[PDB]
Amino acid sequence: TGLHFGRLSLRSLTAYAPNLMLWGGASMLGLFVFTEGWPKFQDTLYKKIPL
Amino acid sequence: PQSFTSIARIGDYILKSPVLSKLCVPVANQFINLAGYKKLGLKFDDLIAEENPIMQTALRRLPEDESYARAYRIIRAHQTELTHHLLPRNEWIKAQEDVPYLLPYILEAEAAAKEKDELDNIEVSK
Amino acid sequence: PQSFTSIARIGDYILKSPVLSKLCVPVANQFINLAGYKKLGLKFDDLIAEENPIMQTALRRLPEDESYARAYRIIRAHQTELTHHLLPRNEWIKAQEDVPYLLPYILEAEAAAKEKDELDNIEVSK
Amino acid sequence: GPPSGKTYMGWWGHMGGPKQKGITSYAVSPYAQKPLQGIFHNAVFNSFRRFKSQFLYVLIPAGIYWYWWKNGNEYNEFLYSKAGREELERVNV
Amino acid sequence: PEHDERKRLGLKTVIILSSLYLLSIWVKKFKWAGIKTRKFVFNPPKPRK
Amino acid sequence: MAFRKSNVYLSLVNSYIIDSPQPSSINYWWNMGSLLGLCLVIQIVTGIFMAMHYSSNIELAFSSVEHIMRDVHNGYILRYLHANGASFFFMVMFMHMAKGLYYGSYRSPRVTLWNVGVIIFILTIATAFLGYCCVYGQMSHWGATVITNLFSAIPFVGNDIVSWLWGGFSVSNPTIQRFFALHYLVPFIIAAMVIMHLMALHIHGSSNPLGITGNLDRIPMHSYFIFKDLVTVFLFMLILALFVFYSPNTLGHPDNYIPGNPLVTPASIVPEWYLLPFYAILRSIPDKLLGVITMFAAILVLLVLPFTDRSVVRGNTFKVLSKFFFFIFVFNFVLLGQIGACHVEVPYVLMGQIATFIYFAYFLIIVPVISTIENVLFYIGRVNK
Amino acid sequence: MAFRKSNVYLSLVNSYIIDSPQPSSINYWWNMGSLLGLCLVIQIVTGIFMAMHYSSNIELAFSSVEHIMRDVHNGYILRYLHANGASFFFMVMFMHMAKGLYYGSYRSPRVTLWNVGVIIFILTIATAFLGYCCVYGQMSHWGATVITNLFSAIPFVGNDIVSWLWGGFSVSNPTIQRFFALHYLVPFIIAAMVIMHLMALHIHGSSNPLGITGNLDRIPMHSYFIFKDLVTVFLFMLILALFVFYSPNTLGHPDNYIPGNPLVTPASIVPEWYLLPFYAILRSIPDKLLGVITMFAAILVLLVLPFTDRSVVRGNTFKVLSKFFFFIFVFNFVLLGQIGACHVEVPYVLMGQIATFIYFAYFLIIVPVISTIENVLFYIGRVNK
Amino acid sequence: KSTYRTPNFDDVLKENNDADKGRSYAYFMVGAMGLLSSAGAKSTVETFISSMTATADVLAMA
Ligand SMILES: CCCCCCCCCCC(=O)OC[C@H](COP(=O)(O)OC[C@H](O)COP(=O)(O)OC[C@@H](COC(=O)CC)OC(=O)CCC)OC(=O)CCCCCCCC
Ligand SMILES: CCCCCCCCCCCCCCCCCC(=O)OC[C@H](COP(=O)(O)OCCN)OC(=O)CCCCCCCCCCCCC
Ligand code: HEM
Ligand code: HEM
Ligand code: HEM
Ligand code: HEM
Ligand SMILES: COc1c(O)c(C)c(C/C=C(/C)CC/C=C(\C)CC/C=C(/C)CC/C=C(/C)CC/C=C(\C)CCC=C(C)C)c(O)c1OC
Ligand SMILES: COc1c(O)c(C)c(C/C=C(\C)CC/C=C(\C)CC/C=C(/C)CC/C=C(/C)CC/C=C(\C)CCC=C(C)C)c(O)c1OC
Ligand SMILES: CCCCCCCCCCCCCCC(=O)O[C@H](COC(=O)CCCCCCCCCCCC)COP(=O)(O)O
Ligand SMILES: CCCCCCCCCCCCCCC(=O)O[C@H](COC(=O)CCCCCCCCCCCC)COP(=O)(O)O
Ligand SMILES: CCCCCCCCCCCCCCCCCC(=O)O[C@H](COC(=O)CCCCCC)COP(=O)(O)OCCN
Ligand SMILES: CCCCCCCCCCCCCCCCCC(=O)O[C@H](COC(=O)CCCCCC)COP(=O)(O)OCCN
Ligand SMILES: CCCCCCCCCCCCCC(=O)O[C@H](COC(=O)CCCCCCCCCCC)COP(=O)(O)O
Ligand SMILES: COC(=O)N(OC)c1ccccc1COc1ccn(-c2ccc(Cl)cc2)n1
Ligand SMILES: COC(=O)N(OC)c1ccccc1COc1ccn(-c2ccc(Cl)cc2)n1
């Protein structure tokens, strides 16, 4: 009968919670493009297998 | 803001209790006299903010005769305040006239919004 | 801009005169063919600018059947022009169809605006 | 343009309040009355009346914070005198 | 080195602005006299409506 | 219809200046927004006429400002007006904000108007800071040193941010030339935020001192509130003229008439009077990183107020308890400025700590608890059984 | 309704960018206004990043620009982009204006939109002139000398205007420091005129190449004309990059790499390519006062066109005679630039006189006479008796 | 009560309205405020414009 909410229902949280992980990625994707060449983060930005 | 359903739940508990009512009511009466809204010719329900849907609903359901008087009390108070005077003491709202004339229309609109809103997020059994 | 009353006054003088008509009409015909508005399926009165009160009046007084056809010719021409093609040669406006269908409604609205305006600035005798 | 999401205030003619019936308003021209008419019976009646109401809400707070600044400034000047050098080396550690 | 000129231009500026401030108080109270003395009366209508 | 209503451009002037409906009962506290608009015009105009004679090189900067004072015709009028005009701009803004806090103007339906205002405040502290550094005296050098070295505590990334802000390894010539070009810019961004601020007011219009609707009695703006605003314009110009012409250096520090020297530290590094309460909040936090967070948090805790006021009435006019704690908060904000102008010594260390707590507890603990108590007292005084 | 339609700020974006009704038949000549908006963003951003390293003193100015080229990281990119970006801004504006002249966009109901545009053009010539003087090479000094000495011919008042413009008795240090502060300002005034320009377009919307109504077939802006505008943005950014990186000094003069010297005159004082046609109009008038009037009259004769076109049809698409004289006027405007880059010698003296006449006779004598002839030919070709 | 009865306005009314005079005093004050503010506007503009004239050091080398 009862599910709790603040306009953001508990199973309105977990029908978007995967996509939160995915858009948490979409911003991970969005800044490790943005800040290579900035001399700081270089430490672990060309740790990749090539390059 | 806080719901009038919650305000009434706390108040009724205080009032039904003998010890708490003998201890919290005189404080509340002199809080009313020090506020000074009767001296401008207003009842308390004139002061409630009206820019929200539950309160817009309550004002439509109000009878015509009570609604015309509310408009006059509000105009009279604005004019009293731009002159920086008070009204004559024979035009002050008395205690027996400061009634909650709008509270039943508010509690009815609130109870319907909660029932509708529980029904839109129900967990069903099988 | 120039009035259609003045355009008609000059034109009629040219046309009634034999020598001037034999000298100025062939120039005017080939000015029409080189313009190329028939190749898009338009009559000349479709081209007149309509954002002025005398021309808004003339379009209300136009019959319904002539008004529905005007709307279609204008839509067909916009579509022909965004594709950068011309219409088929069997859909071109012919000379006998390129009639001034809207001129009488314009000259009537212009003559009434001049009569009204003279009457608003009259010099009276005694 | 298109209409947007509407408000709690309109314009002249459709301001958006309740319907009024039974109220009458009267007024007189300013050219027909005298200005600067009573502005004593104003600064001595109403200003003193308005002051007398809203002055215990402003002055009891002001008295608590000013007393606090005092006892601190008094104590600091004692610490850095020669009679308060022993206390300074106690509290500064 | 501007001390003497500065103190003399400030006498001109303070006299002009002080009179404009008093003139503005006069003009306001005249143009507001209709609103301050306006009166209202209520006669309760019949709730037929 | 009238031309003022039909023309594209005058229609906006008419709807904002001439025919705008205003509540009949608004008082003189509603006149501060007009003054802040004249203030911004004073500063932009006086500043552009000085920029014609200013040089931003670190070896030429102090002497350019003394050249405006001695050799430029009426240049001492431009500077003192400009320098004291910024002190007046900040005082009218604190009173404008304190009003809205008293009368509940932050509440719905005007939450968007309060938030654009918080942005204007941040961009205005930034502007004034950048301009004081361009004088390049001795409070200019060591004030920029203390604030810019705060960003060297951000984890793993801090020492890259300070060297990019400086353009080198210390406050030097590249720092002073970039701070002047940014100081010219930000005033034009504040003006664009002031237009967006007015658009959000036009939707619902203004509130009034009683906290109820104003749609039953409205007065047009022209010739009731235009002439009411002249009253406060001329009082503002009078008091400002009295500082510019008769006491033009009382709202400053003498050390900034000493030229800037990296090799001699002053005995007391002190900001202007209008940044002292925020300077005391910073000094109260022993850790460097937490201090710079707590200082910026002091500006952005204002955005939390629309959700912590739990009352059904707008404003404080009829509220007894909420009046007492409004004036506690005002005089606690004046003590923070005083403590920010003192030496770091007993007992001014603990005083600024307790007062930094009271600044934050007002928005987060006091307002919710008194608002709820006041609601329930209104109920049991009328409905008693 | 949708949030983009209800919010105060996004409602303006939606009405101007997303849901705006556009005629179905507009071509790529309607894409220039978008480019002029990107141009203004390029110049303002590149200029603010250079102002961090620039010094306006006359003894420091030339060497500050060479310091941006050699010592500043990527500073050669900022300058060449900026210098060649102004040449591109002017070329897109001439094409934008020539379009409106061809399609009759000046006519009623859009007379107000044409007039705000003429203002933008004047303020844009002023901006570019002030910036070239801040380099302070040898075309910078002697170009400001020639133009500022023109105002000494105004009767009884002229020699007071030049000395107030200079700040002295010649082009000197006070002149170069005031021209830089004004050069930063005027771009922000152009931006405010661009907003007023767009407000006047929203009333009646845009025209179309046929010159008839467009209310019978409309397409929204988003995803038909947004993606049609990307096509020309990337072509603009390609051709500009080809000048910045491979030929960055072909649209300039070598003398401006010589530092400014009042004691040595160049053998040829020549403006940039985009002010040469107006420079030939000035040189064509033997008298000094009449010359400076005739030059400014060349910009403000554009305001006379809404009253001299006497035609019942909008635009030139179906007009044979009015097409021939549109292209006479365009190539007469290119000869005036060429003659403005020549020595004052036979026969370039009389050529520029006859061509200055044809510039003025087009707006005042040619358009009224051909428009009337064309109206009457349309009539007698259809109505023949 | 009838709407044809006007309420009491005798606290605020004049000697005799005397339209020759009621207009006299209001427009002397509106005229004085326009006179002083037009003079003040003219001193403000001339102060800003004169700042662009030659400085003292430039006139010393004249
Ligand atoms: C830095 C300079 C900036 C320039 C302007 C600053 C003005 C800010 C002052 C604060 C404010 O705006 O509120 C003031 C408030 C009274 O406002 P109210 O509408 O309730 O009362 C209308 C009046 O009765 C009718 O006033 P009336 O319109 O009839 O006459 C005008 C009056 C001029 O008063 C003013 O200019 C108001 C600022 O004429 C005279 O006083 C004659 C004597 C020469 O008074 C109070 O509630 C308490 C005032 C004391 C606290 C002030 C502390 C501020 C730091
Ligand atoms: C980061 C942002 C932080 C900002 C912190 C803000 C601190 C800035 C300090 C500014 C001081 C201004 C305080 C007054 C606030 C303005 C609003 C106000 O106080 O309301 C006026 C009120 C009117 O009286 P009523 O309650 O009767 O309501 C009107 C009738 N319907 O009447 C009153 O309430 C009393 C008015 C008297 C005001 C003077 C009291 C303060 C005196 C010293 C203050 C020192 C400041 C330097
Ligand atoms: C919101 C607007 C502005 C504020 C609040 C502001 C603030 C300040 C402050 C506090 C100072 C230091 C005063 C001192 O000398 O003690 C200053 C200095 C200065 N400002 Fe501004 N400013 C503003 C706008 C401008 C603009 C737009 C310009 C340039 C066009 C400008 C140019 C200058 C200059 C040249 C100085 C040098 C020092 C001086 O002349 O006093 N200011 N500014
Ligand atoms: C700095 C430039 C500012 C300008 C030019 C400006 C302008 C104005 C004006 C003209 C008004 C209407 C009149 C009035 O209520 O006084 C107003 C109202 C308001 N302002 Fe500002 N303001 C500025 C800054 C701020 C700031 C910093 C805040 C808050 C942090 C703010 C919040 C508000 C609010 C809430 C109102 C509505 C008050 C009400 O209707 O009761 N403004 N502003
Ligand atoms: C409509 C916008 C602008 C236009 C059309 C424009 C035009 C010009 C031109 C033609 C030059 C000379 C180019 C050369 O070196 O040969 C120049 C130089 C310069 N401009 Fe601008 N400008 C604009 C905006 C700005 C702004 C907003 C600033 C400052 C924030 C600025 C700062 C400079 C500087 C510092 C120079 C020095 C010389 C150089 O670096 O090339 N410009 N400008
Ligand atoms: C910074 C300079 C300018 C900007 C950013 C700008 C922007 C725009 C934009 C976005 C449009 C939309 C339709 C179109 O692209 O044709 C437009 C139209 C127009 N502009 Fe501009 N413009 C500028 C300068 C000018 C100038 C200098 C003129 C004329 C002297 C002018 C006159 C017009 C006219 C008449 C139209 C309407 C054309 C039509 O609808 O057929 N504009 N402008
Ligand atoms: C037919 O209909 C159309 C239409 O076709 C088009 C294309 C557009 C879009 C075209 C336009 C021209 C509008 C674009 C707007 C402008 C050109 C005005 C730009 C105004 C400015 C003030 C630009 C300034 C830009 C900045 C980035 C200033 C800030 C500077 C910074 C961040 C650099 C300095 C910062 C640091 C930290 C050093 C329309 O709006 C439109 O209307 C319906
Ligand atoms: C509630 O109703 C109100 C209201 O009460 C008020 C008071 C206002 C009034 C205004 C404001 C509150 C603020 C708005 C102000 C701005 C956006 C300010 C813009 C500021 C500027 C300083 C622009 C300056 C531009 C210039 C070109 C001048 C600079 C330099 C010059 C002239 C030197 C060059 C000179 C020569 C000779 C070369 C309203 O608009 C309003 O409507 C809502
Ligand atoms: C404003 C006047 C027009 C001038 C041209 C405007 C240029 C800037 C806007 C760029 C178009 C973005 C719209 C895409 C969209 O929302 O639809 C998105 C597409 O987004 C995507 O996933 C594809 C990536 C977008 C490609 C971006 C291309 C260039 C971006 C800028 C280049 C630098 C200037 C689809 O959703 P929709 O169909 O409902 O609109
Ligand atoms: C929104 C901001 C509110 C404050 C705005 C203040 C701006 C001042 C404009 C006042 C215009 C009054 C309308 C004129 C009129 O009705 O007829 C005027 C009446 O007013 C005047 O004579 C001028 C009086 C005051 C001088 C105006 C400038 C004040 C100082 C400006 C300081 C900079 C802000 C004509 O006189 P008459 O009606 O008797 O024929
Ligand atoms: C840009 C900042 C963002 C906010 C918007 C700014 C709005 C404030 C503008 C201030 C008012 C300006 C006064 C305009 C005077 C009346 C204009 C007019 O007569 O319209 C035109 C003529 O205007 C012009 O030719 C050029 C005006 C350029 C003005 C440059 C300042 C009259 O034509 P019409 O009778 O058809 O009125 C327009 C009907 N929509
Ligand atoms: C012409 C010059 C000036 C005018 C500029 C107009 C064009 C500017 C484009 C602005 C981009 C969009 C800005 C944010 C849009 C969302 C606003 C919003 O959600 O409103 C508020 C949030 O309040 C804010 O914090 C405003 C921050 C403003 C940010 C300053 C850039 C909530 O949305 P709200 O309920 O008010 O919308 C009503 C529709 N139901
Ligand atoms: C835009 C700046 C306004 C700042 C006002 C603040 C008060 C300080 C005044 C400093 C003014 C400098 C000029 C001066 O000293 O003049 C002085 C005269 O004093 C005045 O009249 C006061 C002027 C202010 C009245 C309001 C004018 C309205 C604004 C006009 C905008 C078009 C001396 O000038 P003088 O050369 O002797 O003629
Ligand atoms: C008017 O100028 C001064 O008083 N300055 O700066 C030279 C000064 C002078 C001496 C000592 C300290 C300062 C600085 O004090 C403060 C306190 C807070 N901020 C700040 C600055 C930027 C931003 Cl975004 C947010 C907060 N600055
Ligand atoms: C880009 O800069 C140059 O080409 N400049 O200026 C240093 C130059 C260089 C050498 C020779 C001549 C000039 C000037 O040529 C012109 C011709 C007309 N204007 C003008 C200026 C302002 C205004 Cl409002 C209206 C018209 N200027």
TrEMBL record, chain E:
Localization (cell): Mitochondrion inner membrane
| Similarity annotation | Belongs to the cytochrome c family.
Give the protein name, as stated in the record.
quinol--cytochrome-c reductase
Q: What organism does the UniProt record list as the source?
A: Saccharomyces cerevisiae (Baker's yeast)
Q: What is the lineage of its organism?
A: Eukaryota, Fungi, Dikarya, Ascomycota, Saccharomycotina
UniProtKB/TrEMBL annotation, chains F, G:
**Family, per the entry?**
Belongs to the cytochrome b family.
Name listed for the protein in its UniProt record:
Cytochrome b
Which Gene Ontology CC terms are recorded? Answer: mitochondrial inner membrane; respiratory chain complex III
UniProt cross-references to PANTHER family, sorted A to Z: CYTOCHROME B (PTHR19271)
Matching Pfam families, A to Z?
Cytochrom_B_C (PF00032), Cytochrome_B (PF00033)
**What binding details are noted for the cofactor?**
Binds 2 heme groups non-covalently.
InterPro entries the record matches? Cyt_b/b6_C, Cyt_b/b6_C_sf, Cyt_b/b6_N, Cytb/b6-like_sf, Cytochrome_b, Cytochrome_b_C_euk/bac, Cytochrome_b_N_euk/bac, Di-haem_cyt_TM
What the protein does comes down to: Component of the ubiquinol-cytochrome c reductase complex (complex III or cytochrome b-c1 complex) that is part of the mitochondrial respiratory chain. The b-c1 complex mediates electron transfer from ubiquinol to cytochrome c. Contributes to the generation of a proton gradient across the mitochondrial membrane that is then used for ATP synthesis.
This protein's cofactor list reads: heme b; heme
User: What gene makes this protein?
Assistant: CYTB
| Native species | Saccharomyces cerevisiae (Baker's yeast)
Q: Which GO terms describe its biological process?
A: mitochondrial electron transport, ubiquinol to cytochrome c
One GO MF term attached to the UniProt entry: metal ion binding
Q: Is Membrane set as a keyword in this record?
A: yes
The residue ranges of the Cytochrome b/b6 C-terminal region profile domain are 211-381
Checking Gene3D superfamilies in the record gives: Cytochrome Bc1 Complex, Chain C
- Membrane topology, as annotated: Multi-pass membrane protein
Task: Give the main location.
Answer: mitochondrion
* Origin: domain of life: Eukaryota
Detail which positions bind a ubiquinone.
Answer: 202
UniProt-annotated location(s): Mitochondrion inner membrane
So where does heme b b562 get bound? 82, 183
Q: Please state every residue range assigned to the domain named Cytochrome b/b6 N-terminal region profile.
A: 1-210
Its transmembrane ranges are 28-55, 76-98, 113-135, 147-169, 181-203, 224-246, 289-308, 320-339, 359-380
